[PDB]
């Protein structure tokens, strides 16, 4: 309660905005209209204000658009069917009751496909409006008054939500994508040092969050293409996809840290005395990789270009010293006695596995650097100077 | 869409069952009332039918219980406020708007907590019913005549939905969990064979499905506890929690196949001439591991116990043969002229990493066999005669 409120004040502003929007969609009902029935059709505005008010502006825009489309398509369909029913007499309330089964079946079948998982609420509003329009106006024949009334109540319930969301302390999805891209670099940098220290002593979230967030970055990128230009992002087509490309480049490197963490938790291990012969080189490689990842995160946070100097020189030299040391003491990994216990040999080879994995991690960084250069060039970052 | 219908005929009966329930509600409203009231309040039965129909019986029962608690908790609070607002005479219209503001704020703050994210469907029902029962009876005082005429249409909708869902082709979540476990056992074996075949040439779906579904198993287990005993699952408390343990053991075994697939896509690779020296042992270990996994999958599907003979003897012999072979040719993996280029040394050292990862995969199977024995004992599996 109070702890979460103090930690993040964005959710108290969100809750107060929802309260304000409801209090307005209620004062308008009380005073702006004295009609008796006006107060029974209040559910078509409250459902709208409870289904379209979202955390970000782009999600609210998308949901509003979808709801409008659904309602209009099903009001047109309902009107057309109600007209066409009269053609054959005596078949009334039977040819209207045989179309609800076919519309509900087509709607559900179309709603269960995997591609259409971002329109789940416009199919429900389509079915609800079709059935309501057909059933309500059957006895009296008045279908257009019901259609128009309900549509106006939905635009009256969606425009106050959009105004309140956009004008009182807006939250943007593009800035959330920018901050998640910044955060992943630090999580991976912490994970690598955690793994190396854990293996050399006498993590999970760091690589999991980067390896388990592609969907979040694709939804945040689907909401960011709806928002108008604002703040630091002034072009009319911001390259929001190069952020996803850089995030994927970083996930490809985080899979090796996941494999090193799995190397720490194995059934077959090596004697500590043997591992303490390579401590210096491994600690150097870990320090250099953490420095590089933190420098790339800092340069992405400030929207700056890369300098003239090469950033991978020191990590490359550290990995070359590691290779030289491994070449100088290779007699502690293989059994030289036999040359033409299984546990002892597996314990010996688990150290060569750990070293090979660290070298592969150091070899996968150039792709991340290239993706960063491409993003810094398409997004017009400023000169480091 | 026709193809999706032929691949899963389970999706063509759900749509026809929803259509049939909607048609039954339509007929009851059309023929069992001579007054428009049941036609004018007919949006509540349609909304209930579209909201409360789920793929499984246990999800329908649990979500219906949680949706029937929010409506009965939001219907008494609105009548207590509408009865306590009389005291504040004259200024009795501001106390009814400050309560919509307070309830809105509180319900959104509670819904934003990170442990309540799974119950976002009960807070919407609570907020909608409170706001409707407070904005609908304001100008007349008929607060108890608006909460009793709208609850029988929701009882009609819930009853029709429950009868049609439970009595026409019921779908059970325990069978879904059983089939998921069998499918994961098959997929891991196919991925294991694919990895070795791809490495020795002159995968994603399996481990990616068996490592990214724990949430699905937890949801299916949460739904299967509400269902009554049926078919082969005849017991008051079926041990549905012993399936998740076996799934977790299989996920721990599949992280090594994911590390071997990552070994295939590495930037540093070993020469083919040195790879072909160890072809026989790797092929044998792959054949044995795939046969063992498929045998355990067939034993799980048929609900049968393990026999007298040991199931791990041949894979345990193959691993020892591979170890002996590696011991006899270890001079091909290291440089023995420096004992006291980097790319060549790393390429030589990658083969030992592939071999060590296969040995670790072979070492992780005892835990899965123990989990299977525990499940076969707690669930009263039958003798494998
Ligand atoms: C999501 C917006 C609110 C939707 C309101 C319609 C759902 C009605 C509340 C659920 C009740 C269904 C459970 C059985 C109810 C009963 O036994 O009376
Ligand atoms: C204590 C009685 C609960 C009243 C809830 C009735 C729900 C009415 C739906 C608008
Ligand atoms: C678009 C045809 C007129 C009816 C639309 C009503 C929307 C509910």
UniProtKB/Swiss-Prot annotation, chains A, B:
Molecular-function annotations in GO: monoatomic anion channel activity
CC annotations in GO: plant-type vacuole membrane
GO biological process: malate transport
Membrane topology (UniProt): Multi-pass membrane protein
Subcellular location: Vacuole membrane
UniProt keyword Metal-binding, yes or no: no
Disruption outcome: No visible phenotype.
Biological role stated in the UniProt entry: Vacuolar malate channel. Has a higher selectivity for malate than for fumarate. Also exhibits a weak chloride conductance.
Family recorded in the similarity comment: Belongs to the aromatic acid exporter (TC 2.A.85) family.
Protein name: Aluminum-activated malate transporter 9
Taxonomic source organism: Arabidopsis thaliana (Mouse-ear cress)
Gene transcribed to yield this protein: ALMT9
């Amino acid at each position: 309660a109070w702890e979460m409120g103090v930690s993040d004040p964005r959710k108290i502003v969100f809750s107060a905005k929802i309260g304000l929007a409801l209090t307005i969609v209620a004062l308008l009902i009380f005073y702006q209209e004295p009609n008796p029935d006006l107060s029974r059709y209040s559910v078509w505005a409250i459902l709208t204000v409870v289904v379209v008010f979202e955390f970000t502006i782009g999600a609210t825009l998308s949901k509003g658009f979808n709801r409008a489309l659904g309602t209009l398509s099903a009001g047109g369909l309902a009107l057309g069917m109600a007209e066409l029913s009269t053609l054959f007499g005596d078949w009334e309330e039977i040819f209207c009751t045989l179309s609800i089964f076919c519309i509900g079946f087509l709607a559900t079948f179309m709603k269960l496909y995997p591609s259409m998982k971002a329109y789940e609420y416009g199919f429900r509003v389509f079915l609800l409006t079709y059935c309501y329009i057909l059933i309500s106006g059957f006895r009296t024949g008045q279908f257009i008054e019901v259609a128009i009334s309900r549509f106006l109540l939905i635009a009256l319930g969606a425009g106050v939500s959009l105004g309140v969301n956009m004008f009182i302390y807006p939250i943007w999805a593009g800035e959330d994508l920018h901050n998640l891209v910044v955060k992943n670099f630090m999580n991976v940098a912490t994970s690598l040092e955690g793994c190396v220290n854990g293996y050399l002593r006498c993590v999970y979230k760091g690589y999991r969050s980067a390896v388990e967030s592609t969907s979040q970055e694709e939804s945040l990128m689907s909401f960011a293409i709806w928002e108008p230009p604002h703040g630091p992002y002034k072009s009319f087509n911001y390259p929001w996809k190069n952020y996803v490309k850089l995030s994927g480049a970083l996930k490809h490197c985080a899979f090796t840290v996941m494999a090193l963490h799995g190397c720490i938790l194995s059934e077959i291990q090596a004697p500590e005395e043997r591992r303490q012969v390579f401590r210096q080189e491994l600690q150097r490689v870990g320090v250099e990789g953490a420095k590089l990842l933190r420098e790339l995160g800092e340069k992405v946070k400030k929207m700056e270009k890369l300098g003239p100097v090469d950033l991978l020189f020191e990590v490359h030299l550290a990995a070359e010293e590691l290779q030289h040391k491994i070449d100088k003491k290779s007699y502690l990994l293989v059994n030289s006695e036999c040359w033409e216990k299984t546990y002892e040999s597996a314990s010996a080879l688990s150290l060569a596995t750990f070293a090979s994995l660290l070298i592969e991690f150091v070899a996968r960084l150039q792709n991340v650097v290239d993706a960063f250069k491409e993003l810094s060039q398409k997004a017009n970052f400023k000169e480091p100077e």
